Structures are given as C-alpha cells and as structure tokens.
Curated annotation (Swiss-Prot), chains A, B:
Gene name for this UniProt entry: TUBG1
Gene3D superfamilies: Helix hairpin bin, Tubulin/FtsZ, C-terminal domain, Tubulin/FtsZ, GTPase domain
CDD domains: gamma_tubulin
Full protein name: Tubulin gamma-1 chain
Record's keyword terms, sorted: Cytoplasm, Cytoskeleton, Disease variant, GTP-binding, Lissencephaly, Microtubule, Nucleotide-binding, Phosphoprotein
Subunit comment: Component of the gamma-tubulin ring complex (gTuRC) consisting of TUBGCP2, TUBGCP3, TUBGCP4, TUBGCP5 and TUBGCP6 and gamma-tubulin TUBG1 or TUBG2. TUBGCP2, TUBGCP3, TUBGCP4, TUBGCP5 and TUBGCP6 assemble in a 5:5:2:1:1 stoichiometry; each is associated with a gamma-tubulin, thereby arranging 14 gamma-tubulins in a helical manner. Gamma-tubulin at the first position is blocked by TUBGCP3 at the last position, allowing 13 protafilaments to grow into a microtubule.
Illness the protein is tied to: Cortical dysplasia, complex, with other brain malformations 4: A disorder of aberrant neuronal migration and disturbed axonal guidance. Clinical features include early-onset seizures, microcephaly, spastic tetraplegia, and various malformations of cortical development, such as agyria, posterior or frontal pachygyria, thick cortex, and subcortical band heterotopia and thin corpus callosum in some patients.
Family to which the UniProt record says this protein belongs: Belongs to the tubulin family.
Organism: Homo sapiens
Binding site residues for GTP: A130, G131, G132, T133, G134, S135, G136
Curated annotation (Swiss-Prot), chain C:
UniProtKB keywords: Cytoplasm, Cytoskeleton, Microtubule
Subunit relationships: Component of the gamma-tubulin ring complex (gTuRC) consisting of TUBGCP2, TUBGCP3, TUBGCP4, TUBGCP5 and TUBGCP6 and gamma-tubulin TUBG1 or TUBG2. TUBGCP2, TUBGCP3, TUBGCP4, TUBGCP5 and TUBGCP6 assemble in a 5:5:2:1:1 stoichiometry; each is associated with a gamma-tubulin, thereby arranging 14 gamma-tubulins in a helical manner. Gamma-tubulin at the first position is blocked by TUBGCP3 at the last position, allowing 13 protafilaments to grow into a microtubule.
Native species: Homo sapiens
Main location: cytoplasm
Source taxonomy: Eukaryota, Metazoa, Chordata, Craniata, Vertebrata
One cellular component term from this protein's GO annotations in UniProt: microtubule
Superkingdom, taxonomy of origin: Eukaryota
Included range, full protein: 718 to 1016 of 1024
Identification of the protein by name: Gamma-tubulin complex component 5
Swiss-Prot record, chain D:
Complex formation: Component of the gamma-tubulin ring complex (gTuRC) consisting of TUBGCP2, TUBGCP3, TUBGCP4, TUBGCP5 and TUBGCP6 and gamma-tubulin TUBG1 or TUBG2. TUBGCP2, TUBGCP3, TUBGCP4, TUBGCP5 and TUBGCP6 assemble in a 5:5:2:1:1 stoichiometry; each is associated with a gamma-tubulin, thereby arranging 14 gamma-tubulins in a helical manner. Gamma-tubulin at the first position is blocked by TUBGCP3 at the last position, allowing 13 protafilaments to grow into a microtubule.
Keyword flag Cytoplasm: yes
Subcellular location(s) per record: Cytoplasm, Cytoskeleton, Microtubule organizing center, Centrosome
Tissue: Ubiquitously expressed.
Broad class of the protein's primary localization: cytoplasm
Function: Component of the gamma-tubulin ring complex (gTuRC) which mediates microtubule nucleation. The gTuRC regulates the minus-end nucleation of alpha-beta tubulin heterodimers that grow into microtubule protafilaments, a critical step in centrosome duplication and spindle formation.
UniProt superkingdom: Eukaryota
Entire-sequence positions represented here: 298 to 631 of 667
Disease implicated: Microcephaly and chorioretinopathy, autosomal recessive, 3: A disorder characterized by congenital microcephaly and chorioretinal dysplasia associated with poor vision and nystagmus. Variable ocular anomalies include microphthalmia, retinal folding, retinal detachment, optic nerve hypoplasia, absence of retinal vessels, round areas of chorioretinal atrophy, and attenuated electroretinogram. Most patients have mild developmental delay and mild learning difficulties.
Family designation: Belongs to the TUBGCP family.
Taxonomic lineage: Eukaryota, Metazoa, Chordata, Craniata, Vertebrata
Name of protein: Gamma-tubulin complex component 4
Entry keyword annotation includes Acetylation: no
GO CC annotation, single: cytosol
Amino acid sequence: REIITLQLGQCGNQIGFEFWKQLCAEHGISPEGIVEEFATDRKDVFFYQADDEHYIPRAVLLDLEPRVIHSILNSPYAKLYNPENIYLGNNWASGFSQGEKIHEDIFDIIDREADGSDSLEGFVLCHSIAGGTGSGLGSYLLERLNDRYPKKLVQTYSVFPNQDEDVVVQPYNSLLTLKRLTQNADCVVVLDNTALNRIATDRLHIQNPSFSQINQLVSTIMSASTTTLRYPGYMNNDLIGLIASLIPTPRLHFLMTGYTPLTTDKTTVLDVMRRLLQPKNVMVSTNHCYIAILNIIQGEVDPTQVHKSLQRIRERKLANFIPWGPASIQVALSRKSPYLPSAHRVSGLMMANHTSISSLFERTCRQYDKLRKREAFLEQFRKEDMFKDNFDEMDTSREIVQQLIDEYHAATRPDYISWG
Amino acid sequence: REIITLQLGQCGNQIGFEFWKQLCAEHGISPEGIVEEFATDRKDVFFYQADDEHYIPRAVLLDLEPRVIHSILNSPYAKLYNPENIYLGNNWASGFSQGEKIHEDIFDIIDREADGSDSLEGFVLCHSIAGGTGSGLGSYLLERLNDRYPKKLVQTYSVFPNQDEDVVVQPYNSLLTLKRLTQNADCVVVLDNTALNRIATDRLHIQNPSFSQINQLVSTIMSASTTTLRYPGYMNNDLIGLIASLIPTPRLHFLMTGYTPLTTDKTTVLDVMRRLLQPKNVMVSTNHCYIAILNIIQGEVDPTQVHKSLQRIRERKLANFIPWGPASIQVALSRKSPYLPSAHRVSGLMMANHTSISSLFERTCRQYDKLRKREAFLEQFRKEDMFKDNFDEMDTSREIVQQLIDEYHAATRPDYISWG
Amino acid sequence: EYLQAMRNFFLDTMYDFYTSIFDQNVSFLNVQLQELDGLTLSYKVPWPVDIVISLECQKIYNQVFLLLLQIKWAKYSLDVLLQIHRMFLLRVKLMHFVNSLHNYIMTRILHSTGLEFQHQVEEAKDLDQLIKIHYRYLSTIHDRCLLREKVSFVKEAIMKVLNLALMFADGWSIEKMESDFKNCHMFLVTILNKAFPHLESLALS
Amino acid sequence: SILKNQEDTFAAELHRLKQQPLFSLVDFEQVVDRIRSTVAEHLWKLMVEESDLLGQLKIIKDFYLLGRGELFQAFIDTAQHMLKTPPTAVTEHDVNVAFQQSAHKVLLDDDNLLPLLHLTSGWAALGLSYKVQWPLHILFTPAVLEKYNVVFKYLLSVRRVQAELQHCWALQMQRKHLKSNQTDAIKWRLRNHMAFLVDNLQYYLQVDVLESQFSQLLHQINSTRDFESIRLAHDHFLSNLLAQSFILLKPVFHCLNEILDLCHSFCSLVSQNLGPLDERGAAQLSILVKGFSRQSSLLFKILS
C-alpha cells in the first residue's frame, strides 16, 4: 500500500535529506515539487500527490539539539515539503526520557499523517545505532508504534557504529537499542561503517568527509530497494511480499546488502552475480551459511543468459549456503532507470539472511561483557540512574542477546529442523 | 588439472616475481590483471579467473626476514595479486624450526587455496638449495605436503649452490635438503650457478648483477616448460603425462634442461637439435648415457624436415645414450608465441634424465665427507644441536645419498635390467 | 495499444483487486474494477479490433488468467502470517515451494514468451499474418501451460497442492500434513521424471 | 552474382552456335568452360569469406578429429558409466548432459550450442552430429560427416586407454614411494611404460598424419579459385586420412584393435590391484605378458 517514512537523529535526518534529494533528481520533478513536462511513474507511496502535482513526501521530521536540521530548514528543497511537524543528550536514557515526555503530541503528528493516508503498508525510520540523540529516543518510538499498531510493518535502515576503539557507554546504548530491535521490530537492514570505509577508500581517496559519500551510497541503496515500488513492477510491490521469504523466524530478521559497482563513475549476469557473491561487494563486513538470498537486477539484460547463469551457478557451487532446508536464492529484474545517464548499465542489489553477522554482534557482546565485568563505564550519569536504579535491564538485554546469538549458532546447523 | 604455485625464500620469491612479470608481459593483460581488448588463451592453471577477468595467480607468498619481499609488496604488479597469505636464520634447522611452529596457519593457507581450486594437478615451489632462510623450511613444508597429499604431484625448480669455495655448514644443509628431495618428491628439475655463469659471460659482459639475468633465463625456461599448458596443446596437458616418460625410478628423478639460443637478442630443426645436443647449451654443467630425453620446439617449423632430421640423427649417432632398454628421445611442438616480437623464430627446450649429474652430487659428497671427517664445520650452532643431539641424521642422509650415487652408477650399466 | 493493455494489466494492478477477495456479489467486482473459483469479466471491445481478434482467444486468456490468480492466492495466503515451534518449519518447507512455483510461471512463461511475442507482432506488415501470429501465440501458451490433454496427469497435482495453502492457513495436525506433502511431492516427481524439452527448467529441485 | 550480368554474353555464344550448320566439340567445350569458370568462381568467392570455409574446417577438425582435446578429456573425467552396456533409454540424454556440463567449467561458455552427441560398449556406440550452414554448404555432405564420425570413434579409443594407463600409474606416486618393494613379488616389471610407449609412438604417428594433411589442405584452397578443384582437394584429403591412419580394413587395423584391447585389459588388472597384494593376480598377469609377446611378434608381420 502506502509507506510512511520517519526520520530522527543527526545521521537519520542526513540520510533522509540525501534520499529525498536522490528521488528529486531521479524522477522528473522540480525542487519545489512541480512535475517537469519533459518526463510514467508512481510516486504515491513515499509522496502525497497534489493538484499542481506537488509530491510532498511522507517524511515526519523530529529534531533534538538542531544544528544540521537548521541547514535542512533553509534549502531549495524546503519548498518540496512543509508538513508542519518539526518539534524539539547523547545518552540512551536521555533520548528515551525526552521522547517519553512529548510522546502525545508526536503521536498526534503520527495520527495526523495516518489520516493523511487512505491505506498503509509500513513505517520506515531513518536512524543510526548509538547516534546519541537518536539512540534511546528511537527505541522509545519503536515501542510506541509496536504498542499502537500490530497491523503494519516496520523496516529499519541503520548502521553499526565502529569508531575503532571518550564515550564508553556506547556498547550499553547500542545493546539496549538492538534489544528493542530484535523484540519490537519485524525486519532489520543493518550496515557497517568499516565496510563502507573499505569501499570508499578503494573507490576514492577521501578520508575526512566520508559521511557525505556514505550518504550517497545509502541513497543509491534506498532507491534500489524501492525501485520495484517507484517504477511500476508486477511482483512484490508490497513490502511484506519482499520481506516474507527472507525471514522465517522472529529474532533472526537481520538483512545484509550488496551492490555490484564499488566505483560507479558488457557486464553480464554471470559477472554481476559472482561480484555480488563477494563480501567486498557487500557493505557489511565454523563455516557460515545463508538461510536465503534475494537479488534484484536493474539494467540492460538479455533474458536468455540468466537461465544459463543460474545453471552454472549451481554447477560451480560458488555460494555455500545450507540452513537445513530448501531455501535458495531469488533473482528478480527491475527497470533500468530513465531520466538519468545510464552508465554502468547493469547493476544488482542483494538481500540475504546470513548467520555471519552474529559474529559482529558477538564482538559488541565481547566488549559490553568486558565493561559489564568492570562496571565503571556507565559513568554514573543520572538519566540511566533514574530509568533503572538496579540496572537490571542491561542484564535482561544480555540474556536476550544470548538467546539471539544461540539462535544464530543453532541456525547454522542442519539440525534446525526443530526450533526454527 | 589446475596447478598451485608456491614461493618462499629470497631467490624463490625473486624468480616467482620474475615469472609472474614474464607471464604478465607475455599474455595480453594489465599489471592489475585486466584483460586487454587487443588480444585465445587458457590462463586457468596458474591464475584464478575473475569477473572482470582478473587472473589472480595461484601464488602463496611466505616470507622470513623480508627485505626484497617489501620491494615485491610495493609494485605496479601488486594489484595483480592479493590472496592475503603473507606471513612472517640462515640455517637448515633454523628454517625447519621456524616452519615447524607455524605449520598450522600456513596449512590453513594451503587448505584455503585448495578450496579455491575445484580440481588439482600439482604443486610447484620456488626454492633455492642452501639459500639460508629457504633451506630447511622448504624441506619441512615438503614433508608436510608429502604427509598430507599422496594424490598430487610436486615439481621443483631449484639451483645448485656453487660460490667457488665463511659459511661452511652449507654442504650439510644442502645434503639434508636433497635427502628430503630424493625421498619426499616425485620429480626434480635442478640447475647450476656455474653453467648460467658461463652462458651469461658468453652472451653478455656482466659479472655483478648476474642474479637479475639469471632470473630472466629462469622465467624463459619456466614459460617454455609451461607453454603446452598455457597455450592450448593437445598432448601432455597434464603434468604427469610429461613427467611419466622421463622417470622410471623413484630416486633417479632429477631432470636437466637446455635451451637453444644462448643470446636471444633460418635456424632449422637439424641446427637446433644439434645445438641442443651440446652441454654448453644445457644449463647444467666412464661414459655417461641418458635414460630418456624429451624435446619441445616452438617456432616457425616446416613439418617435413623433422622426419628427415631424426633419420639423420640416428645416422650420425650424435647422441650417446643406452641405459639398457628402449627409451629414446621424444620430440614435440608447441605454438610460437604471439603478443611479443617473434625474433629468433625457432627455439627448443630439452628435458632429460642423464647420469652425469651424479658426479656433481659426488663433488658435494666429496666436500661434505671431508668436512664430516674433520667435524668442525657445523660451528656448533644451537639449532642443529636441538634438532639432533647425536647428529645421526647427517649419517642417515650420507647413507641415502650413497644409495643414490650407487643407483646412478648402476643405472649407467646395460645390466640395469634388474634393480631399476 | 489495446492488446498491450490486455497482456499487461493481467497476464500489479490486479494484486489489489484479488486481495479483497481473500476477505461474493456480481456487482461489487464491477465497482472494484472501474476504480471453487471463477470470475465474471467483460470490458468494452471496439469493432475494428473486434474483427481482427477472435472471440475464442479471450476465453483462452481467461483460463490461464484464472490459474495465475490461484498462484497469487497461494503466494499471498501462506505469506501474511504473524512441538510448538514445529508449525513454523512447515511454513518454510512450503513457503519456498510456492515461490519456486511462482517464479517459474510468471517470469519463465508469462514474461519470456510475451517479450518474444511483442518482437513478433512488431514485424506484421499485413492484416492476415497478424491474425496468424497471435494464433501461434495461443497454441504455444496452450502447450507450455498444458490445458488440452494428459491434464489428469499434471494439473491435479497443481490443484491438490493448493489445498495446503488453505490447510496451513487454518491451522494456528502438523504430522498429517507432511505425510500428505511427501506423497504428492513424490507423485509429482514420479510423473515429471519422463522429461516438452522445457520441463526440466523447473525440475532443478 | 555476375552470372546475371554476363547472361546475354553466354546466350549470344549459344545462339551463335545455333546458326552454324557445323558442329565440333572443340568450340563447344570452350563455351561450357567459360561459363563454368564464372559459376565456380562465384561459389569460391562467397564460401571462403561469407560462409567462412577455413575456420569452419578448423572447427570440424577440433570436434571430429579431436583437434581440441581439452573438452573430450574433461568429458571422460565426467563420464564413466558407458564402460557398461547402455540402457539406450537414459544414456542418450546423459552423455549430452555430461558433455555440456564439462563445457560449462571453461571454454564455450558463450555460443555454439550446435554440437549434439548421438548414441545408437558405450564408447563403441557413441557418435556425434554437428550442424553447419546446410543451404550454404554442399561440400559438407552426410557421407563426409559419416567418415568423420568413424575417425572420431577411432580416436576416442586411443585417448581413453592412454588416460586410463597414466591414471593407473600410482605406483610411482604411492606404492614404490617411501617403500622398498620386493622385486618381482610386488612389482611386475612395471610394463605400464612398455604398454605406454607403443601407444605414445602411435599417437605421434597419428599426430604427423593429421598435421601434415591439414596444413596442405589449408593451402590448396587458397591457391585454387574455382569450386571444381576444391572438390578434388577435399576428396584427396579424406582418402589420405583414411588410408594413412590405417583405419582402413587391413590386417594391420585388426592387429591395432587387438593391441588396444590388451592395453585396456591390462589397465583393468592394476585398477583393481589397489594395494600391493597377490589375489591370484599372477595367473592373469602371466596371460597378459604372453599375449603381449605374441602381439609384439605380430608387429613384425606388418613390418615384413
């Protein structure tokens, strides 16, 4: 149906601004949202359609300690939207309490936008894990929606914070955030800072403004994942039809992504498939096996090569996945995009559930457990002191992520016939 | 099938680097491994093929006390390979013990590369006899592979150290190394420093940078011996089909080589044959008789002269070989190479088992036995002291090379009908 | 243009149409459109193209359309859901099976031959050959989706596995389903093992 | 072509011959040869370039004369069930499956789906059918491809027995390796090499026979520019392959077949020998060595 976008936090509002500029340049519209005559499309999912065809986006903007939100405010794309929804620490409990006191009027903003929609499919939020102001607040509003609406979906695109370890309560905050993510969300798409750092240092030579190019890559991914919605396809034009195959189980619902060019400034279906089989073309860093993989391709493809390719892909066994049961790769095609120069013609996007990401969770678990053994790294800030006097929510989150990692490590096994 | 290359030691990594630069310039590819459009070939034996046709070589790089390995590291051919396999005295027992402690993770590197291959034909190693860091270590990894895989072949290209005699334990180290070579390897290709010194002083006037030109000649030989693999032939495109005729016996498996131009900056099949009959065109220095000879020719040949030539080659008796039985010369043709200037059109390569090399072994035996009679030339280094307190492995190696030289001298006889 | 709209919007838009049918009258379908099974479909056909396209062709389109709706039914009905855990893995073992089916019918049949079919109809320089080339679309979509004869060896299996999409949706015993599933699966394989050449393209797993 | 251009010329020559009340063959043959020159020249002009005669001849050599040997060796790597009698109901599809699968690993991953294995041992019943430009070629006929399939059947047998013989050479790899091995109670004279030499030399002889004739064939077509001579070149080529390769039904051909049968049977012993052991294998081994000596005596009834 219709999908409502949400954005909060400094990194989330940055990537949302980049996503809307991406879809502004991508389709034939003005930076005030007037349709271009020279351009057909559906933009009714993420944009409300007006009478002069002002495709005003379904983007609710929440801010706390605004500095870059002011730069979003005075912009030549500030005529695209004005839904009148902008409403004003670096701790999880701080952002949790700040969202707690204003939950009513932001819920009025939610219900107003819900009344703006006739039907609904899902909520996306722009969020970053352990982002400071975003952390805790995002978990709180996730709790609010999960309490309010069991009839809809939530998709979440968020990055894993790694700054190569002043902030030492960051593993605690990310742990509590991911606890709410496993239990109160239905599907998670997670990425790494380090893998995008690798691809950025390979494709280019920039080190300091890396955030900006990260925003570009996030925008390309978020357009790619939505192309079968925005350009009219004929299958999985609901989100739940896309999500249904990849997630059999309500705790292992974390999805990793890839995209075939590292630098984007013929390719055949065989080439782009085997490139997409690499972890260096995947933007997330015993043998680990996928449960299921999905691929969507967009470009100038020849339809007869593709059956040749998946024949030979069976034959070489260039993937190694065996959960326990008959769940394999799903390949799909979307339109090569007009209204932009189509260079690097064929490009693919890849979506899988793989057990290896548990190791990265385990790395964070190893850090948090170490700090939990010392118990000197909450720094006795008053916010976490009010919200839990005994700090037992950290132990509850520890036992939940223990269940999660154990479910992961059992999910590797070909005896996962039971407990799936 | 597929052949995995190995390289270790200073001289071995030097000749491997020269071999890969040789096959880089020889075929139509970039120094990052991108195929040239202007170029067909098989490079699937010694290079893994990628999606942008990056022929990343099957070269595992091991280093110890790296100085020239650093120069290999920063190179415009360092984009051709990166298999992530680089892992850190001048004694046999020292290199043996250093390989002994890290045998597990280098064996993980071995098994990873084995999983990179679908099938397998053989392992080549780049090694130099009594090279210091290479010596002992190479014998140890030879023991590891001979323990691990009896299903494959090992080919070895290594030089005989002669510096015209500060290092006096060098005959002991070379003796122990060749002991492992006779008993744990299936086919050996050995060369001399002095014969390459003769050819280099004849073709040119250099004396000090002789190593560099030696590397060039080794690269030309190693390309020549592999041409029927890399350029598609139709016979002996397995290694074992090449090796099978020359070696009847598991201790006399040492193969000597020749190559027709000394200087390479018509020739008929008669001319190049009789040139190849000389020991001055052979790069290794009672009457001695070959067991069997093999020749491969590459150039602009006329196919009717070749039967005329071997008629007259019988008639003049310009070779003198009689082991005891009906094993004679084998002449073969490979493609004259495109993608390089074909000057010195017809060129041949020669592969035989000849008993004369025993004399050179005997020379080393004469040296070692002399030092063994004095027993002052191990210098009491602690490494050989730990590894053998009684130094009885030297006596065991002495009795083994005694068996080897006696097998050689009996192999000269036309009563070798038994014990063959 | 009219033929393009025909073979595009059925053989998407009909997704929303069929989702309401999960939750019947003859007039409700009309107002949804103008915005065990078998539907009533009629739309305005203009005369100068009514004489070039036969009447009986639309019936064939209707048959394969009905089967496509059943494939949509199974790919949605098992795919909306929110020992004890044992129910879930009869999801996965079955949720794959319809998907592998649905990818074959839509892409490999109803999108390959249609892409070929457009490339054929663009070359019609005559009214007469234009009628033939769509008839030679009919007779090959009639054999790819076997609707003529030997249908009692194939199509009943596709029909009987659709009952599992009702059965698993109703449950929320487990063992009585796998006993059924392995039998119909092995029956399908012991029929399908004969191979006309295209049929191994689905028999990969 | 140019035949329509000079059509009035040749019709004028013939109409001129009509007027003459005098007939001779000498004037007549020049007219028929003059027309024949142009008509054969047009076919030779089109066929070498637009139907790509020389490269298609190279492909035919690769696939029937085993001029490409990488595919048909990896083919025997992935096909060994046709050493039994075929059911002829499963195997005819299965050999094509194994063939295309072996091609899928390397080399012909883009086009040329045209070759198709045909099946009527299973290495004595397997053939091949290959498609060419059939309206454009009348120099490639079913008889020509039939004799090609006969040569294909001849060559596969040599490749097969030599591959089996080199693969059974695991004595050097394992059994004599690190083991002293009692003389003529473990080792058997190691007649593997003796059996290998007689096939390796014969292979080299076939090598010379193929390489000389194909090189002369790719030159005669360049020299001659009318179709009539091209016909003679091809009809010479085929007979030379047949007669010189000794596939032609002679006493030598029956002897060579028997040589091959002995090498195959000798492979069968050392395959099942596995570990160094006596399992009454010496009786079979004595049968083989006496048969080898008698067939070696047969080799000097051909020499004489």
